RNA sequence: GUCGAAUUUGGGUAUAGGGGCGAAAGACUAAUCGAACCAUCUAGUAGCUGGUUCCUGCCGAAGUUUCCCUCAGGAUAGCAGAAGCUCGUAUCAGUUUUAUGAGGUAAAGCGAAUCUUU
RNA sequence: CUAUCUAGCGAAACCACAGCCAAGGGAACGGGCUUGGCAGAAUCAGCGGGGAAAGAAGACCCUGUUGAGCUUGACUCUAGU
RNA sequence: GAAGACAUUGUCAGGUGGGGAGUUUGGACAUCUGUUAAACGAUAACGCAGAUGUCCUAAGGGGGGCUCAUGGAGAACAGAAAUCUCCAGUAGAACAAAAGGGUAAAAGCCCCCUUGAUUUUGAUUUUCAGUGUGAAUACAAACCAUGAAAGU
RNA sequence: GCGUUGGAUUGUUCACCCACUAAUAGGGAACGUGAGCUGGGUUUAGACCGUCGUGAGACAGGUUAGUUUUACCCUACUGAU
């Protein structure tokens, strides 16, 4: 859960900061249209909002599946699979981060 | 397939006020539960299949064309290590399950259409919530 | 007294310990499941703590279609300009 | 808390142990009650616990077999001591060598079968 | 008003032997063993860390061919009717 | 006054009878094939994949005949799918069933005769205390079955 | 080296807000700390409701009521001859 919140608190620092290109002003929208290309701008931020909600889904499952671990050799594996499937979302997100 | 003891996947549930009723058992491993299930009463039941450990869908990888498709499970035909866990549904490893194929749309002899296959799971779902099953070709 | 005996009742109507005029013969195994899970020092029931043999034999009546169903019954801008362009 | 009554209390008297009495707690019945106290049968029974009183010399173990409503115990076999008896080089031995048997395990083999040709 | 000090009176629990620690091994967490740190008579008032200090051959859990109380078409009987 | 050869009382007999009395309320257990099992044998675990509390007057005996599973080439119907026929066929078939052995002029498939699946009691093998129970093997004395005969 | 809080809902830690602040960091010492406290909750006997049982009673369970009480001893520590 603590790693799961750790990725979201970084993602909540991205989706809050960027200036929300629709409904700013039709001038500030339209400098950023020519200079930053609205399509690539809106797709990459919506990829992270997809990537934020998948971290919440994996964190809420692997705490809920972990409550029936009957040994140490089973509870360790649910910890590693919970961190690995979050790393899969990050490695997949390698290209939209360098643009942002 | 390693040998799975019966002392695991069964939990001593000591019930009542004075915790001395060592009767009830809980399956601590993963289970397909069926489509229409409607739990039996608590005074009537003996064996408990919990709510969190019920995987409905499974990752179905195909050796031919190399495509992994996320497909739902319909039935559990063959379970090793007893015929008893066939009726229960314990889904450890080597369990052959009956998986539909509707999105693939394969063509048979006569070309009517194929809508279901047989797939064998390949990993313990205790280690991860994913259920990986190689569709047997 | 002479009539209400186990030997003289079963002749009137026509083995598990505890069968009576009451519940049944089948209820005695059923109502003894509330005390069934105990280990006696013989381990407890449904916890054998042993490794079985899990073999899957090869059968030709696999690898195929399950039942049947008939023909009668039933862009990306990331492709053009990726990110750095 | 209750305090004019289903109140409180003295004396007399009635009910005695598988019985009494109970506006019911298994309560109470002489500091004892899910069955009073006293003496006898009685030194009741225990496959369970604790203890077992002088010195030196010699020999010296077992936790294993089969059976038992047997699994904290017995019976049987094994191992051990003691008494000795018939005889006196003797038949031998937790060992090698010569000769001759039986094996199918490691290796080898799938241009052997499908689990053994060697 | 005690505690405290004095005159008179004056017990009990408990007790193998007794009393400074760290580490190591160890019936699985030493007052004693082994290698170290140290160590000076006699003692008074507080104190509650330890002395597995003490209240209970444990209220907890298993055993016994050991009981008792209670219940029912368990077995065997019995007063009564 | 009431009642009367009935009640009552005595002795046996059936029915009822937790109101009461005494006591009890077990701990892969009997077995056969494979494997774990490591080249004699023996060897464990709530090791393991499977069988049994039956079945047959033949599916027990004896003698005579014959070759199976399977493929190739063919025959109005009839085709991959009955019957016919030939070439190859070390058993790939079959034997009441689990499983492991063993089996080709047979232990299989078909026919001929039958009751030894009998009587008397010993010796021996397996688990083993070398006790019992079970099952088994080789003889002797009979009396039989069968076969041309040896033999069984 | 030094510092890491005040409150709000259940026996509750679990789980999560409100505001301040330089900051509201994480852990251990028999999941520190009952012969320090607490008995709130953990475990008898009283009693009710629910499920199961013919029954005695047991619980899938919920609610309420409820006795373990040294220190003067040697050591440790704070003080005193």
UniProtKB/Swiss-Prot annotation, chain A:
It comes from Saccharomyces cerevisiae (strain ATCC 204508 / S288c) (Baker's yeast). The gene is NOG1. Belongs to the TRAFAC class OBG-HflX-like GTPase superfamily. OBG GTPase family. NOG subfamily. It is found in: Nucleus, Nucleolus. It comes from the Eukaryota. Involved in the biogenesis of the 60S ribosomal subunit. Associated with nucleolar and cytoplasmic pre-60S particles. Directly interacts with RLP24. Present with 28000 molecules/cell in log phase SD medium. This is Nucleolar GTP-binding protein 1.
Swiss-Prot record, chain B:
Transmembrane segments: none annotated. One of its GO terms (biological process) is ribosomal large subunit biogenesis. GO terms for cellular component: nucleolus; nucleus; preribosome, large subunit precursor. Keywords: Nucleus, Ribosome biogenesis, rRNA processing. Signal peptide: none annotated. It is found in: Nucleus, Nucleolus. Involved in the biogenesis of the 60S ribosomal subunit. May play a part in the quality control of pre-60S particles. Under normal, rapid growth conditions, high levels of NSA2 would allow the progression of pre-60S particles through the ITS2 processing. Component of the pre-66S ribosomal particle. Interacts with NOP7 and RRP1. Interacts with RSA4 (via WD repeats). Present with 8660 molecules/cell in log phase SD medium. Belongs to the eukaryotic ribosomal protein eS8 family. Ribosome biogenesis protein NSA2 subfamily. This is Ribosome biogenesis protein NSA2. The lineage of its organism: Eukaryota, Fungi, Dikarya, Ascomycota, Saccharomycotina. The gene is NSA2. The chain holds residues 125 to 261 of 261 of the full protein.
Curated annotation (Swiss-Prot), chain C:
It comes from the Eukaryota. The modification Phosphoserine is found at residues 45, 70. It is found in: Nucleus, Nucleolus. Residues 1-14 are annotated as: Disordered. GTPase that associates with pre-60S ribosomal subunits in the nucleolus and is required for their nuclear export and maturation. Belongs to the TRAFAC class YlqF/YawG GTPase family. NOG2 subfamily. This is Nucleolar GTP-binding protein 2. The lineage of its organism: Eukaryota, Fungi, Dikarya, Ascomycota, Saccharomycotina.
């Amino acid at each position: 859960k603590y790693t799961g919140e750790g990725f979201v608190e970084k993602f909540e620092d991205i989706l809050k900061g960027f200036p929300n290109i629709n409904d700013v002003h039709p001038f500030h929208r339209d400098l950023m249209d020519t200079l930053y290309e609205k399509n690539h701008y809106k797709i990459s931020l919506a990829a992270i909002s997809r990537a934020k909600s998948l971290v919440e889904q994996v964190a809420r499952d692997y705490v809920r599946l972990l409550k029936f671990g009957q040994s140490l050799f089973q509870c360790k594996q649910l910890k590693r699979a919970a961190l690995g499937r979050m790393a899969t979302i990050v490695k997949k997100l390698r290209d939209p981060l360098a643009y942002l | 397939v390693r040998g799975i003891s019966e002392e695991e996947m069964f939990k001593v549930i000591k019930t009542g006020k004075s915790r001395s009723k060592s009767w009830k058992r809980m399956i601590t491993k993963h289970t397909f539960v069926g489509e229409g299930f409607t739990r039996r009463p608590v005074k009537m039941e003996r064996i408990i299949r919990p709510s969190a450990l019920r995987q409905k869908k499974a990752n179905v990888t195909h050796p031919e064309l190399g495509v992994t498709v996320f497909l739902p499970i319909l039935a559990v035909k063959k379970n090793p290590q007893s015929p008893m866990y066939t009726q229960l549904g314990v889904l450890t490893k080597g369990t052959i399950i009956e998986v539909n194929v509707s999105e693939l749309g394969m063509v048979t002899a006569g070309g009517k259409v194929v809508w279901g296959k047989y797939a064998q799971v390949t990993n313990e779902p205790d280690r991860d919530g994913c259920v990986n099953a190689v569709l047997l070709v | 007294g002479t009539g209400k005996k186990e030997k003289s009742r079963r002749i009137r109507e026509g083995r598990v310990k505890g069968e009576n005029f009451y519940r049944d013969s089948k209820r005695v195994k059923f109502l003894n499941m509330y005390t069934s899970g105990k280990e006696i020092r013989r381990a407890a029931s449904f916890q054998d703590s042993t490794i079985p043999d899990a073999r899957v034999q090869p059968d030709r009546r696999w690898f195929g279609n399950t039942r049947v169903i008939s023909q009668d019954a039933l862009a990306r801008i990331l492709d053009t300009e990726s990110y750095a362009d």
